[PDB]
Every structure is written in structure tokens, then in C-alpha cells.
Amino acid sequence: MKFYIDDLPVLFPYPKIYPEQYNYMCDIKKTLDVGGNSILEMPSGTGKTVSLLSLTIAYQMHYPEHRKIIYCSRTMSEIEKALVELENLMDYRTKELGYQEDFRGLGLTSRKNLCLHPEVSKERKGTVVDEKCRRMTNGQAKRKLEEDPEANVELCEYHENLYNIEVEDYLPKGVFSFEKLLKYCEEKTLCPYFIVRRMISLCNIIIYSYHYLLDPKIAERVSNEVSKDSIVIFDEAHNIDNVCIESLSLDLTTDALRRATRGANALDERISEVRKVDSQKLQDEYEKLVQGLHSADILTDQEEPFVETPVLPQDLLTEAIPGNIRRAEHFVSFLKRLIEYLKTRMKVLHVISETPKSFLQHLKQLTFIERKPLRFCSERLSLLVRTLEVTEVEDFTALKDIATFATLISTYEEGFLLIIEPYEIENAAVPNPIMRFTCLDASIAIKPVFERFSSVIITSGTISPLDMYPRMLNFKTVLQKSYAMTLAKKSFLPMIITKGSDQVAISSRFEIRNDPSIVRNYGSMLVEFAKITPDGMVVFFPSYLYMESIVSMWQTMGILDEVWKHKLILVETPDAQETSLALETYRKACSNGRGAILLSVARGKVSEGIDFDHQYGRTVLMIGIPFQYTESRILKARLEFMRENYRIRENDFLSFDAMRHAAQCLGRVLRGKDDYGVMVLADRRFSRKRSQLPKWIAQGLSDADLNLSTDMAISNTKQFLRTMAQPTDPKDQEGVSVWSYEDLIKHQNSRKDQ
Amino acid sequence: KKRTAKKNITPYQRGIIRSLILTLDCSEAMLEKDLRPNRHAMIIQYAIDFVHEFFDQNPISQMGIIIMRNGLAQLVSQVSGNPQDHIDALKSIRKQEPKGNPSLQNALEMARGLLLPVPAHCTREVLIVFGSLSTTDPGDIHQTIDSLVSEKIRVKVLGLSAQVAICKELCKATNYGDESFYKILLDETHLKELFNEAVTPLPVNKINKGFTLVKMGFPTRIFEDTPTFCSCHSKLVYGGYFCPNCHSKVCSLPTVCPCCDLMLILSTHLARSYHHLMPLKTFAEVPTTEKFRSEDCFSCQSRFPXXXXXXXXXXXXXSRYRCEDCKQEFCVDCDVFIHEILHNCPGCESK
Amino acid sequence: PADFVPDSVSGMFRSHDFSYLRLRPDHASRPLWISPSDGRIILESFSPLAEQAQDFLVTIAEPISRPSHIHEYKITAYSLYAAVSVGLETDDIISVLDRLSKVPVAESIINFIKGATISYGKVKLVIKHNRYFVETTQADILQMLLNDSVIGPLRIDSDHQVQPPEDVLEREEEDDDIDAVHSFEIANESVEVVKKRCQEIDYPVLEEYDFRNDHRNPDLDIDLKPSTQIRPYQEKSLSKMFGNGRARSGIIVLPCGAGKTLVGITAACTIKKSVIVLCTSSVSVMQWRQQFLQWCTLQPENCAVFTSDNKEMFQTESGLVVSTYSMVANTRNRSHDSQKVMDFLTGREWGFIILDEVHVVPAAMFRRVVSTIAAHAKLGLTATLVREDDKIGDLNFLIGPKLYEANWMELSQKGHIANVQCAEVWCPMTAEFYQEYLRETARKRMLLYIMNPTKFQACQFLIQYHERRGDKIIVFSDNVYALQEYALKMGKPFIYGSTPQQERMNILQNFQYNDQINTIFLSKVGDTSIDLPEATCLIQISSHYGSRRQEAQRLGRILRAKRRNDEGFNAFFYSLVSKDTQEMYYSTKRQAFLVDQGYAFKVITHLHGMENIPNLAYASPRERRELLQEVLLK
Numbered sequence A: 001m002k003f004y005i006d007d008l009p010v011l012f013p014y015p016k017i018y019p020e021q022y023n024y025m026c027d028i029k030k031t032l033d034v035g036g037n038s039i040l041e042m043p044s045g046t047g048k049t050v051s052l053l054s055l056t057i058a059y060q061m062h063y064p065e066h067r068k069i070i071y072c073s074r075t076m077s078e079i080e081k082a083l084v085e086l087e088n089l090m091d092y093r094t095k096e097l098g099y100q101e102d103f104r105g106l107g108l109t110s111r112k113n114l115c116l117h118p119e120v121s122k123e124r125k126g127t128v129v130d131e132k133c134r135r136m137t138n139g140q141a142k143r144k145l146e147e148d149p150e151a152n153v154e155l156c157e158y159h160e161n162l163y164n165i166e167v168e169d170y171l172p173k174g175v176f177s178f179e180k181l182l183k184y185c186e187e188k189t190l191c192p193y194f195i196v197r198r199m200i201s202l203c204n205i206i207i208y209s210y211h212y213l214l215d216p217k218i219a220e221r222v223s224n225e226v227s228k229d230s231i232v233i234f235d236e237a238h239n240i241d242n243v244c245i246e247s248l249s250l251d252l253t254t255d256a257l258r259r260a261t262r263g264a265n266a267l268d269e270r271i272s273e274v275r276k277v278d279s280q281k282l283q284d285e286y287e288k289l290v291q292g293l294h295s296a297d298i299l300t301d302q303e304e305p306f307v308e309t310p311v312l313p314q315d316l317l318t319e320a321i322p323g324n325i326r327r328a329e330h331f332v333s334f335l336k337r338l339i340e341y342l343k344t345r346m347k348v349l350h351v352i353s354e355t356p357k358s359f360l361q362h363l364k365q366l367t368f369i370e371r372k373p374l375r376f377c378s379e380r381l382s383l384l385v386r387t388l389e390v391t392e393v394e395d396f397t398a399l400k401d402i403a404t405f406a407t408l409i410s411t412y413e414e415g416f417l418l419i420i421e422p423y424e425i426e427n428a429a430v431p432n433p434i435m436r437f438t439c440l441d442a443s444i445a446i447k448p449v450f451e452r453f454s455s456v457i458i459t460s461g462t463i464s465p466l467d468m469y470p471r472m473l474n475f476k477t478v479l480q481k482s483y484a485m486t487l488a489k490k491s492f493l494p495m496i497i498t499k500g501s502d503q504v505a506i507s508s509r510f511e512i513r514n515d516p517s518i519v520r521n522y523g524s525m526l527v528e529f530a531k532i533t534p535d536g537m538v539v540f541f542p543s544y545l546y547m548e549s550i551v552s553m554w555q556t557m558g559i560l561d562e563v564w565k566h567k568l569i570l571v572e573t574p575d576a577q578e579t580s581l582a583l584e585t586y587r588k589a590c591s592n593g594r595g596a597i598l599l600s601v602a603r604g605k606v607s608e609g610i611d612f613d614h615q616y617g618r619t620v621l622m623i624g625i626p627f628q629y630t631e632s633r634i635l636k637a638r639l640e641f642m643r644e645n646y647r648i649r650e651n652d653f654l655s656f657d658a659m660r661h662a663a664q665c666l667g668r669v670l671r672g673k674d675d676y677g678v679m680v681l682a683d684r685r686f687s688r689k690r691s692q693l694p695k696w697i698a699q700g701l702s703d704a705d706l707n708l709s710t711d712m713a714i715s716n717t718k719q720f721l722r723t724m725a726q727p728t729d730p731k732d733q734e735g736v737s738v739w740s741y742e743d744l745i746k747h748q749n750s751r752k753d754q
Numbered sequence B: 001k002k003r004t005a006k007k008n009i010t011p012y013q014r015g016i017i018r019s020l021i022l023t024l025d026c027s028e029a030m031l032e033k034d035l036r037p038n039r040h041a042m043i044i045q046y047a048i049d050f051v052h053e054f055f056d057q058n059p060i061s062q063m064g065i066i067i068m069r070n071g072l073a074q075l076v077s078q079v080s081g082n083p084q085d086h087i088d089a090l091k092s093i094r095k096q097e098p099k100g101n102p103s104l105q106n107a108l109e110m111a112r113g114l115l116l117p118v119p120a121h122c123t124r125e126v127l128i129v130f131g132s133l134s135t136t137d138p139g140d141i142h143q144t145i146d147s148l149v150s151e152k153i154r155v156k157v158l159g160l161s162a163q164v165a166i167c168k169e170l171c172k173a174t175n176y177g178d179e180s181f182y183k184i185l186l187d188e189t190h191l192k193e194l195f196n197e198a199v200t201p202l203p204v205n206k207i208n209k210g211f212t213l214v215k216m217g218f219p220t221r222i223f224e225d226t227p228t229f230c231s232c233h234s235k236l237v238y239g240g241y242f243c244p245n246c247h248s249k250v251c252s253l254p255t256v257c258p259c260c261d262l263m264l265i266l267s268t269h270l271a272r273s274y275h276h277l278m279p280l281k282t283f284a285e286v287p288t289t290e291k292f293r294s295e296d297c298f299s300c301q302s303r304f305p306x307x308x309x310x311x312x313x314x315x316x317x318x319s320r321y322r323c324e325d326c327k328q329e330f331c332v333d334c335d336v337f338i339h340e341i342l343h344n345c346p347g348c349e350s351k
Numbered sequence C: 001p002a003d004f005v006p007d008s009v010s011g012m013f014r015s016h017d018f019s020y021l022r023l024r025p026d027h028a029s030r031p032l033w034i035s036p037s038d039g040r041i042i043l044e045s046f047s048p049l050a051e052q053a054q055d056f057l058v059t060i061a062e063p064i065s066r067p068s069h070i071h072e073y074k075i076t077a078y079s080l081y082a083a084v085s086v087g088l089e090t091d092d093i094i095s096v097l098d099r100l101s102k103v104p105v106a107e108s109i110i111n112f113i114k115g116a117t118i119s120y121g122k123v124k125l126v127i128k129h130n131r132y133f134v135e136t137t138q139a140d141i142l143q144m145l146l147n148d149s150v151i152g153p154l155r156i157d158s159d160h161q162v163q164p165p166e167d168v169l170e171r172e173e174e175d176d177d178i179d180a181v182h183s184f185e186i187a188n189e190s191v192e193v194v195k196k197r198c199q200e201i202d203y204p205v206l207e208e209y210d211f212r213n214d215h216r217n218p219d220l221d222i223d224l225k226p227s228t229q230i231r232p233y234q235e236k237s238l239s240k241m242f243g244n245g246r247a248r249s250g251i252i253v254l255p256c257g258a259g260k261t262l263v264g265i266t267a268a269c270t271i272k273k274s275v276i277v278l279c280t281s282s283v284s285v286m287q288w289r290q291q292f293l294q295w296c297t298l299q300p301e302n303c304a305v306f307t308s309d310n311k312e313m314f315q316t317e318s319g320l321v322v323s324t325y326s327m328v329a330n331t332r333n334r335s336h337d338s339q340k341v342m343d344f345l346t347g348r349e350w351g352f353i354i355l356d357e358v359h360v361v362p363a364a365m366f367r368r369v370v371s372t373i374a375a376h377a378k379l380g381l382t383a384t385l386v387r388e389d390d391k392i393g394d395l396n397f398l399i400g401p402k403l404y405e406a407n408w409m410e411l412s413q414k415g416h417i418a419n420v421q422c423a424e425v426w427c428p429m430t431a432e433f434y435q436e437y438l439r440e441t442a443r444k445r446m447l448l449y450i451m452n453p454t455k456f457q458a459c460q461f462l463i464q465y466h467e468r469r470g471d472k473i474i475v476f477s478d479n480v481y482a483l484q485e486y487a488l489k490m491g492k493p494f495i496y497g498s499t500p501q502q503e504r505m506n507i508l509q510n511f512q513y514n515d516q517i518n519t520i521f522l523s524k525v526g527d528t529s530i531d532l533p534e535a536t537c538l539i540q541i542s543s544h545y546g547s548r549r550q551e552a553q554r555l556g557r558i559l560r561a562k563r564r565n566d567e568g569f570n571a572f573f574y575s576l577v578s579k580d581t582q583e584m585y586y587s588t589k590r591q592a593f594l595v596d597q598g599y600a601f602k603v604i605t606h607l608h609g610m611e612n613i614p615n616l617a618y619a620s621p622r623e624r625r626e627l628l629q630e631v632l633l634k
């Protein structure tokens, strides 16, 4: 297909089209003409990234200025979803045009997910795999193999050849997805991480998640050549602010201080033992402090940096001297005073709220380190550790995280709050205190993204309402256009199940435990659907702590007894590999003849990037509306800043994100226009939250679907199963909303240009 | 807005030689109440009506019935051309109530073996009464579906008010890639037309295959009463038929003689195929403004066909559904029968 | 009085004419035939919305006739309150019914339908700050709330306050309608007058029960466990009383002995306040609590069974209690302990009272106790449609609008007592019955036709048939000596007059658990009251059993749930009645009674091989006369 936006010849990959795309594609071009952000509530049941990429794919071949793109999503799962769909698009481009694609796009995740060395790939945690490859070839470790042969330091054998052959050009012509890049690099003795990490400067389109554009420790390789004049797309951008909160958050524990004291003591030996090894190398880095912030060999390196910088990318950091702590021995002096001061500030009476600037002042009197020198810990630790050629790092892991806090405390103030709870409220009154610090204003990292970028697009099918986003993050949109799913068939039934078989209001707000007045209704709901519903059922509980009591007490009674025989149930578990094994055995069951049901968490990992096609989901159940008040007053302290800095109250923020989380989970059940299925939601307050539902879903929720009976909802989905499953393909009522190939788009949309 | 056959079934090839084995399902899902009495009792009767019509329209074929109870595939009647035995088995099925769940893979494994004795000329087909939302596969069900397509065993499934991809994939895979046999049911009349559409042959695209020139016989009648006997059942048969070759007595039926093994058909098997092979064009409602016919019917005498100057009665329609080639008008009630049982168009024949 | 006749207007509004009666305009094009004159909705088979008319009519009216093809409707004055609660529109009910039913909507039928949909069961009562206010949910209720003598005249000008609504709620109107609307808080004097002014103007109000807003009543010690059984008629009585949000008080007539109190105790659990259970009599309090309430999650030690002869803890319970009307205020005041409970019920603000078969106790004490007790809400779980407690103060408007009705046709056909095959055995006559009928006509003859040996042999067919069928056989005989003489001949354990209780339940132990012994002969000791057994074949021998209101209770009582469905007729009933004797009139009253109750009816006069059944004792006419003279002693 080849239609136009009056300037862009679009090489659309699907032979058929969708009007929601045309409404999206028509207006998104206007945004490209006059720059903005243009929150557009594009349908998720429709293929959003299909025309999101294809229009932008046609953008570069026509517009010659924006040679670089940014595609950012919440998880690498949606990165590869873009990768897998876009890969066909480039080959689809060669199918029609011949050889005019010249497009390069690869996903950038990490060393862990793209490692090829069997020695390194064994470990599970990414950091340990990241540490092993980095120590395999480090700016100070890999030199100790080439100049002098040793068995202490090995070689990646894939960064080695990348260092020789890979960094001279680009990958030949493939637009490699995660599945495709893994296969290619395995045979050609290359590790895919070091390709795409280097491919930042060469990829005409760059594929990476939200963290590597926002998280400060990893977004130091960002290139202005691909940042100044580029176009930025944020996929599933509903969960954008929540990520930024974690970026400036850190906890501590009484166990960690024992490790922190271990690191404090063990490094004290480490820096002193190497002094007799090479004392002049120690002092050589001291003269590197008086000259400046070590810029020659702290930022112009291929592999050297070890300590991450949680501060903004080097703009919010002075280059002055870090006080009189130059000496190795004197570095011990303030280290042991500050570690003692924080321990009595780690055993605090209860959660106390002080401005982080005041923490420096109280620190200043107990341990006289001025604010400007304390900002220099991050570049200090790498300057000192590199001299000691340290060989053991296990007890030193605490050093990088505490020093990460040290950079944060001396730099961020009057926007955040320090809290120290002496215990976790679920396991209260124990010696398990936390040095709680969490981000209150997410926009501090958000704004510099808009500071440099010129072309930005934010699009998500679950954002509801669409108005608090510009006020929360402080960015400028122009085109706030909403899309409703215009179809000739219903294909979806959002439900407000306030009343159950008992006709009793059901929820999870009353408590976080089980009760016979409530649990028997939810289980009776699960069994009754299990009798009738077709294969594919996914539920999203408000929390994982909630579900553990739910399932175990469900096992006590015979309510699951009939649920046992109906379908195949696989459960969400804390270990990701097991749940992925659970989920990989869920999709196969759904596609296979036997019915299957999946249970997950609204705040869990499943709601992040998981998709459910026809088989993988037909009827999704939502136990209540998820409220995240279960945790301590950390969020209450966080919520106060939102209430005064912004005009968004607790009530407005709580329900609108909860339904955003609710709308985030629901839309995964539908894949295309053909896809259909009931999305039942069971809570009394869902009557009031009809406003928080997205307009395309909210329109489907008429006033006649409020406070239904679940047995009636069983009849409602019984009618849904009777009506929707019919092969009703009139093929004449399609053209109103299906727009068959290259005929009704040119015929009718010319009438729409008015 | 008009609901008839689009242009015409182009008469080239249709499947009369066949062996369709319907696979019923007696599962606790069929204990769930969807139909009037229940799922199980009602479907059996419409299959009972299906069996006689299937023999009525495809008398040179054979029939088999498969039931699925407690996750097991069970046959109640072998693939055979005996209408009465099939009903008799279904009565016991009707007498009993369902339990358990269906087993798709076992039936698919059963289907491959069951149609193996089916002759080459008979077009292979297995009808699946799949209503539940799960199966029971003791192995790779994708392997057996690969066997049926490779061995040229087309599968049409008759699903209930539920849509499953595996059954849809099964219909797509076996039927030479064609996905057009996944119609489902939602009503008492809705499920019957699925059986009725299975009564008629199911052509989509016939491929070029090695065609077999087969030998079949025509029997002769008997009249003896006191000498009552037959060489097929060895009973007191007061009337039967005889193969022209073996001279072995058979009852009055198209029953194949058990002596020389040559197909026996009397008149219906050749004739019932003939009206299926070449259907005429549907008698569409001729326009009232373009009628130019007298106020009556032609095939029969239906004087009612025009309201004439009566507001919303006149400019309505007319009982003037005329055949295309014959150019003879006919009432909608009459013209429907013209293409319902016997084509036998009057204007086409009266020439 | 605090009750209005409008809760019991049933039995009237069934009369039409032919020249006066207007031909239905919808008859030409209408599926049903809903004639307002006869009060019927004759839903034919051609109705486009025949089920909808029954749903709309069922919510608002009572279908008197239940034919296969065409139905009929009975007068229901209380249906306005239930019809209002269901949601049928005032204009909507008439517009759909007039168009669907062939009989045109008459002005009286339309006005009542218009009144029943909105005015009936749609009153307005306001409340502010979780309290009661002088207002209503709608604009009309706001004018109504201020226009009440106690609601408006006894109201403070303040719209609402936290302290007054929490404490004070012309008294605390907890029987008010939906709050959170325009109103102004009220005084705390005379809810007696407040419910007196509501009924005089005849305004059925959709009352609420906001227990969470009442600070005067603390949270009581109630063990909130719904683990008790739930049954198809129980949940909707809960659901309709609960509705949306807050619960309410009203009349829900229920089958006695079928977990009637189970809705109330579960409703008591939801409200979390002072709840008391009132039973028919003191002896029932202990017997009924011992018969089912142990499996129930209610607390037997806290729910002090008030009897007035055996003493428990009173005026000291932190939670719920179970008692009877006879314990409350009657001549059955065995000591001053009962009166001490009544005094405490004033100082303690009791919010919910569960009633069990109020009809036996006259309602005059119901009004006397209410004024002194100062109760908030009540619950009358009666059983009988017609009662002597229809005095000036109707217990419906005294408590609240009805939610669900004792639809016995629903519970006698859904599996418990399904396929009710009522029978009346006409035992063949003989000389002495005809000799006894002519000589004496006094009631002393009541047992002189009961003693029929063919009756016992007619029972013996049911004895052998039902034990062979694995059914349950129950015999009802108010006499003792002749009843004891009955089942010795067949040589099986059997219930009898003044039986030792442990033995009879041991007889019941072989009865419903074992199949070899299946015949039980319940005497007049069965009611009231003992454990009504599971019923599969009920035999009644006494047919006078005054009065007819006891018969409706007894018919519903002994005929109880049977969790067995092997036979096509899993609930038999037999009335063994000697013919050409006195029990002609009494039996024929039952014959009309069972069919009017809705149960399916037959007559069993010809047993399969009557003269060949075993135990042919006293079969000959001579022997039957001899027993009749022996029965003269009784």
C-alpha cells in the first residue's frame, strides 16, 4: 500500500488499513510540520506501532534533515515488538521500492541480554554478568593481559574481535531485531551488546527503553548528533513518571551497613596495601584532583568507569577540589566519621522528614565536609579505585551504592524529602530500618529531555485522563487529539461488576486479607467463568502480597476444585525466569485445544509489556481497583509534594493512576481489529471511575453496564460468546471501518480533508 | 439488499462420493444448559435429521458417528451407509447424559484410522461437534493435522457458540489451506443449517488428482414370498434384491453384496448426484417495474403478485421470482421450491 | 397507629364489567391480555415481550392464575411498595403494560400503576452528614421531608452537622430514605409519631438503615462469619433488603424451618449492632436454636435463649440475643425476668428485631412494646399471607416495605420439595362408618373415622411403595392411642404421641439416614414446634386441625426440603380421609387449599393391588367396627 499525507508517500505494510491510523497519521503529520509533543490516544486494539513506524519510516526518505530517530518504550519487550514488526517493514520497503531503504536500527538493552561468552552467560543477575564482562575487558584490567600474559585476566573474545573488526563500519544491511540480532551474532563470533552500544552514532533509528534515555547511570553515552535534530517517540508513555521516581530513590538496611562497614574497612586495607605496591601512582592521581575533575581520563575512556553517577549528566556537578581528602590515609579519616554519623541516622526513632540540604548541615557539624566537596565523591571513587587495581569487589559493592547516595544528598534539595523508618510496617518493630529517599518531582529528569529535543511524540492507548500529563511533567504539547474505536462490531465489553452472586459490593479496599463474606464471591466468579469462558483468561491483582493469601485460602476451600478441571492455571511468581516459564507454558496452552488461565499482578511485571492475542486472552478479570496505599508513609510523604507544588490531590491522583493501571492491563487482550473479548472489572467503585476509563473504552461502557450482576455478566459474556464467535463477515459493513485495499481510502478520505 | 446465492454455483465438480464421519460430543460442557432441553439431547436430534438428509442427498456415501465422553474418543457406528443403525446408536446416546470433556486429538487420531478403509473415490471428511472450550491431547495434535492434510483428508468442524483457534487451524490446514468451514451455531435453527450445509457437497477448489475409473453394479428385484430368504442376512426375507454377478441374495436395499464386492445402487444414487452436479441459477425476484408479466404465477397458479396503486403496498415487492435463462416468472414461495428439492424449472423444461 | 392498610391492600381490586368494561385497544395488536378490571395479565403465546410483562408485573403485582397458555393476576396492594423498589417506571409500567397487554390500561389501573411505579415505594427522605434530615432524595421528597409534621416541624434549621447526624440522626430517623440530598437535621423525640404520619398519608417509603452513622449504638460483639448455608430464596431476601449501600427493615415472609432466620442473622452480621430474634413461643427458642443454629455461625452462649423459666444472662450480653414474642410481652410472663428485658430494651437502643411467626401472637403487644423499647428497625419473617395481625397498625408499615414474598411455588419446585404430588386418599366406606355417621355427629367422632383399617392399609401401600422407592414417608395424626395402635402391626419403629425424644430422633435416625425404616407418624406434638423433617411422602390423618391459618403453616412446615431427585415425583403428599364420613367437608377444604397454594394435586383412591398388600389385619368390615368402639374411649 502507498498512500500520501500530501507530502509523505507511505509504504504501509498491512494491505488493509485502519481509520484510527488515518486519523492518527493525518494529524501526527501536522505535529511534524509545527513542533510539539501531541499526546494522541491512539487505539491499542489497533496496531499502533504499525503506522507509528511506517509514517516515520516514510519520514526519513522524504525529509532529509532528521537522520536520527529515538524509539523509547517501558520494557525491552515492546522494544523488540517494535523490532520484530519494523524488521518486516524494511524488507517490505525493498519489496516495493527495490533498494532504497538505507535504514539502520538495533535494540540496545545491556551486556546481560546480549552476552555470548559461555563463561559469562552462566550467571543470572545482569550486574554480575555486566561485572564479569567489564572485568573481562576493563580499561585497567584488560591492559594487564596484552602487555603481560596472565591467567588472572581473561578476554571477552567477542569484545576483542569487535575492538578489531566490528568498529570500522555498520552491520551489513540487516535491521536486526532481538531474535534476529541474537542469531546473527552467535555464528559470527560477535557480542550484540557492543555493537548497538557503539551503533548509537550510526543508527538512523535507535531502539532502546525509557531508562537509557532517563536513567542517569546509563544515559552517559547519549550523543547530541542523534539527540539535537532527531524525532523522539515514547511508546506506552503512560508509565513514564513512575520510572523517574525510582531514578532518584534508594533504600538502606541494617544488614547493608554491616556490608558498608565491611567495605569501609576492606577498602581501607585496599588503598593502603597498594600504597607499598605503587605509592607514586596514588599521588599521581592527587595532582589530577587539583587540575580539575579528572576529565582527561574519567570521561574520555572506552571501559574505565566503575562508579556510576546518579546526578544529572555532568551538568549538575562542579569541577572544583573535593576538600582536603586528597590523601589515601586522610580519605579514611572522613570515611569512618561519616559512616558512624549515618548509622545513628540509620537507627532513627521513626520516619523523620528533613530537607536534604539540612542533612548536609547536620552532617556539616558532626562531620565537617562542605557541600561542594561532597558532590565530588562519584568521580573521586573511580579516581582512587583505578589506582589500586583491586581484585576483589564483593564487599565493595556497598561502596558504590552509598557513594551514589553521597552524590545525591549534596546535589538535590527542596524538591525531595529524606525519611528513615526504623522498620518495615508489615514486619514492624524490628531492627530493620531504612535510609529511605524517594523522588518527589519526576520532572527534574523529564525537563532536560525536552530541553534539547525538538521533535517529540507521546502516544499511549491507556492514558486516561490525558490532561494531567503536561501539568505533571511540565512539557509543551500542541495536538491533544483523542481516538475512539470506530468498528461495526462491539468486540469488547468493559464491565462494572459491583455486585456478585451474593449481589454484595466487591473490592479490595476494605483490607489486604481474606474474609468469607468476600472471598467466596470472587472464587465463585472464577469458577463460573471457568465453566463457560473460552481459552485465555488473564487477571491482574492489585498486589502480589494480596494474591498469596488469596490463592492459599482458595486452596483451603473446594472453590478451585472445579476450577482445577476446567482449564490450565499458571501463576505469577517473584522469580522472573519461572514466571516466564509459567507464561511460555501459558500461551502454548491457550493456542492449543485446552483452555488456560493466567493470574498476575496489576503492579507486577506482566502488566508492563506482555501481550495477549485471541487465544492467550478472551475474558480478563480484575479483582478490585488497585490502590498502592498498602506501603508505609513513604508514598504519603511523596503525595504531599504533589498536593502543594501541583494542584493534583490524593483523590485525583489515586484513582486516575489506578484506572490507568487498570486500562494498562485490559488492552493487552486485543491484538488487531479482528481480536475480541470481554474485559470484566469487579469493584463497586468502578461505577464512579467511568470517567477515568479511556474514551474508546469509556464509550463502550454505557450507563447500562453499571453495577451488573456477575452471573448476569456470565450471561452477558454468554451472549458475547454466542454473538462474537460467529463468523459474521458481511464484507459490506467492513468498508465503513475497514477501508479495503487502496479503494475506500482514496475515495472517501478526500471528502475528509475539509 | 437481497439475500440469495451470489451469481451461480458453477457446475464443474462437487463431492457426491464421500464418507463423512460426524464426531458428536457428550461432555459435561454439554451438560451446561444452552439449548431448550439441553446441549446433548437437542444436537442428537438435528444430527438424526442430518443423517437421513445426508443419505437423501449423498446416497453413494457412508456415515460414521464418533462420541467424546470423559476425555476419550468413542465410536458408536463404524463408517457405513446404514441410516437405521446410526440412529439406533444415537438413541442410546440420547438415552444417556454427558460427562467429562471432549478429546480432540484422540478423535483426530481416530479419524485418520476410521477413514483409511474409506475408498479413494469417496471424498474424505470428518465432522467435529466441538462445543466445549478445551481438548485432551495425549500428544502433538499438530502432527496428526499434518497427517490429514498430507494424506488428503479434509476436515469441516461444526463448533457451538464458541471460537477456538485450534479448530479454526484444523479447518484451515486440512481443507487445502481454505478457511471457510468454521461456521458456528447460536440457535435451534442456527445449528441445523450447519448440518444441512454439511448434507450438500462442499466444494471450494477441486485440485487435479489421479481420477479412478471404478466398477459398480445394478441389482435386480425379487418377488418370492413363501420361498422367503436372503444371502446377506440369512433371515426370513420376504423380499430383496440380487447382484447380477454373484447371484447372492440381498434384501431390498443398496446393500453391497458380500460375494463379489461391487457397489450396488438402484436409481437414487445416480439421480441424487445429478441434481447436485449442475444447479441452475437462483430465481431472483424480478423487479416490479421490470416485471412485464401477468398478475399470477407461471409454474403454479398464484394469482397474488401485485397490490397495484396502494401506497406502501404497491411499490413493495412481487411474487415474481423469475429464473434467469428460462425467463419465466414465479412466486417467491413457488420459486423457492423450484430450487429447494427438485430444480425442474417449468419455463426451462417447457420449450 | 404507626401502620397503614396500604401494605395489605391485596385481595381487592379484582372486578370488571362488560358494557361498563372498555374493550382493550391493544387487543387487535397486542400479545397479552392485561385487563385492569380483573387485575389480571393474561400473557398469551404471541407476546413480543411476554417475559418482560411478567417481570414488570411480577415485581409490581401477584399473578393469581398460572395457566399453561394464559395466566391471571391477583390483587396486591402491597405490590406498590415492592413494585416501587424494583424500579418499574410510573408511566413506564403502564405504557409497556398497556401496549403489551390487550386489555387497555384503565385510569384506576394506570393511576395505581403510575402511583405504584413512582408514588408507591418511591418516597423521599433526606439525610445529611450520615444522619436523617428534613428532605428527600428528589425535589418532591425535599418538600415532603420538610412537609412532615415530625420530619419538618421537628427539624432544626441547620442543614447538617457531624455530631447531630452521628448522635441525633421527631426522633432519630434511621428508617429514612437515601441520604446525601437536600435536608435539615431533625429532633430526637417521636419516631412513633413519625411513622404515624407516614402511614396516614399512605406514603410507602424506600427506607434505608445506616448503622455505620449511629454513634449512640456501639459496635457489638458479633462473630461475623457467613459460613451458614445460603439458599436461592435467601440471597435475594438479603439482596432486596440490602439493595445498594445501606440495608433496611421490612417484612419478608419465609418458610418456617427452612432457615427462615438465616437471612436475618446474616443481615444482622452486616449491620453490626444490637439485634434480637423473636420466635413463636419460648419452647421454640431452645428447640429451634438446637435444631439448626449450631451449624450457623451465630453464638449460642451470647444469643441468650430467653424462655422465662430457665434463666440465662440478660441485660449483660455484648451482642445478639434470641427470644420470642411470648417472652417479650404476653400472659406467658413466667416471672419478672421477661419484664426486666423489656426495661433494658428501652435503655439500650435496639436497632434490629427478627420476628419468627408473629401471626400466632396478636399484634396488640407489638405496638405496646415498640413505643417503650424505642427500636430503630425491625424484621418480621412471617409465613402466612392472611393473618389476624392486620389491625390498624400494619406490621408492614410498622417495620418497613416488603422486599420478597414467600413464593412457595418457587421452593416446592426447584429441587427441595419439587414435583409436589398432593393426594387425598378416599378409603372405601363400610357399614360402621355409615352407622357411625348417622348415629352421632359430634366432634367426638373425629377419631371414629380416623381408625379406618383400609386407611392404615392405604398408608401401608405408601409404606411399601416408598421404602421400595427409597423415599421418605411421613404420617400426621393428632391422636395418640389409635396412632400407637397403627404401626405396631407393620412392626417398625414409628413416631407416636408423647414419644421419648431420643427414641423419635433415633426413629428419625433410621428414617432419613436409613431406608429400611421410612414411615414416621407425627402427632400434634410436631407443631408448635419441633424439627420439621425432610419430606418425601407426607400423610395427613387429622383434617380439621383448626384453624386454616395453622394449616397453611403446617402444610409449609412438615413439607420440607428433600435433597433427592431419583423419582419423577420426589415430594408426595397424601390425605388419608374416610369417605361417606364427617371428614368430607374438612378434606374438601384441603383439596381446595393445596391447589390454591399452587402445589400440584391428584387423588389416590386406587392403590396398585390394594387387597394383596401385606398385613391384611382388620380388612374385613366386621373387624373395623370393633376398633371403632375401642376408639370411642378416645
Ligand code: SF4
Binding pocket: A111, A114, A115, A116, A117, A120, A132, A133, A134, A136, A155, A156, A157, A158, A159, A160, A190, A191, A192, A193, A194
Ligand atoms: S566480550 Fe562481549 S560477549 Fe564476551 S562477555 Fe564481554 S560483552 Fe559479553
Ligand SMILES: [Zn+2]
Binding pocket: B230, B231, B232, B233, B234, B235, B237, B240, B250, B251
Ligand atoms: Zn437380508
Ligand SMILES: [Zn+2]
Binding pocket: B243, B244, B245, B246, B247, B248, B257, B258, B259, B260, B261, B262
Ligand atoms: Zn454380487
Ligand SMILES: [Zn+2]
Binding pocket: B323, B324, B325, B326, B327, B328, B345, B346, B347, B348
Ligand atoms: Zn428457469
Ligand SMILES: [Zn+2]
Binding pocket: B297, B298, B299, B300, B301, B302, B330, B331, B333, B334, B335
Ligand atoms: Zn409458483
